[PDB]
Amino acid sequence: IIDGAPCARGSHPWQVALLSGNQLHCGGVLVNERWVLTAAHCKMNEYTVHLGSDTLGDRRAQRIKASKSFRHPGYSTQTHVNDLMLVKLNSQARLSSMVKKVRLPSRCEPPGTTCTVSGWGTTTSPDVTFPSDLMCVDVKLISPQDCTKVYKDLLENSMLCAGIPDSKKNACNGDSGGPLVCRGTLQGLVSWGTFPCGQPNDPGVYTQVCKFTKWINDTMKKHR
Numbered sequence: 297i298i299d300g301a302p303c304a305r306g307s308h309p310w311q312v313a314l315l316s317g318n319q320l321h322c323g324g325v326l327v328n329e330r331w332v333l334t335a336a337h338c339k340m341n342e343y344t345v346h347l348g349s350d351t352l353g354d355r356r357a358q359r360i361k362a363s364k365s366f367r368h369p370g371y372s373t374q375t376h377v378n379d380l381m382l383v384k385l386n387s388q389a390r391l392s393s394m395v396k397k398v399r400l401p402s403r404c405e406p407p408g409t410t411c412t413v414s415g416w417g418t419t420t421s422p423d424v425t426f427p428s429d430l431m432c433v434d435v436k437l438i439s440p441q442d443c444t445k446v447y448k449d450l451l452e453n454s455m456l457c458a459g460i461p462d463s464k465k466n467a468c469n470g471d472s473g474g475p476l477v478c479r480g481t482l483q484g485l486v487s488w489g490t491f492p493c494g495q496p497n498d499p500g501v502y503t504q505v506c507k508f509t510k511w512i513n514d515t516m517k518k519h520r
């Protein structure tokens with residue numbers, strides 16, 4: 297996260313982290329006891345999921361491994377459209393005060409709506425610096441008509457944009473799969489932007505979740 301700050305402890309009980317052994321790879325959210333949602337470009341042969349703590353390595357966090365993952369069939373390794381993926385935990389996550397399910401959308405929020413995105417991604421760029429505590433930052437959703445003026449062809453109806461004018465507030469390396477929540481429900485998952493990160497007027501592109509809740513619901517059942 298760039299130009300943000302440490303999130304208030306315990307405010308993101310549905311936020312998780314995908315690790316390769318002990319090194320941060322991406323982020324994600326907990327759908328339910330045995331399902332994690334995240335980015336499709338964060339695919340791995342095996343994951344070590346971190347849950348129940350804003351501090352990586354916390355002795356009180358839950359560490360669960362996952363071997364199976366399901367990508368949206370329409371995803372593209374070239375354009376990154378439909379960039380979402382479901383991860384199945386080898387064992388059920390124990391829900392507690394620090395571990396809860398995210399509130400999926402039932403409607404799409406319009407432009408202007410303020411949101412918040414979090415992650416353990418690098419807080420600098422091009423230079424690298426990975427924090428141990430979860431970072432937060434506020435951004436506003438941008439209209440498809442405005443975002444196109446910036447990315448043009450690089451945008452499909454399933455992509456959502458957010459950010460603040462002339463501001464570096466944004467996501468970066470290691471934040472993919474992280475949640476963008478607005479008005480209570482998950483509105484998106486970090487996907488892509490420009491590099492170096494935090495370039496002024498270069499919006500962050502997310503996976504608009506208000507259009508994949510049916511796919512998320514059917515997929516879980518299918519492999520339940």
Ligand SMILES: *C[C@@](*)(O)[C@H](Cc1ccccc1)NC(=O)[C@H](C)NC(=O)[C@H](C)N
Pocket residue numbers: 321322335337338376467468469470471472473486487488489490491493
């Ligand atoms: C996979 C995830 O970590 C990452 C998120 C991110 C990285 C850099 C800038 C903004 C967000 N997504 C990607 O690696 C994505 C394909 N990267 C892009 O921004 C490309 C290189 N333009």
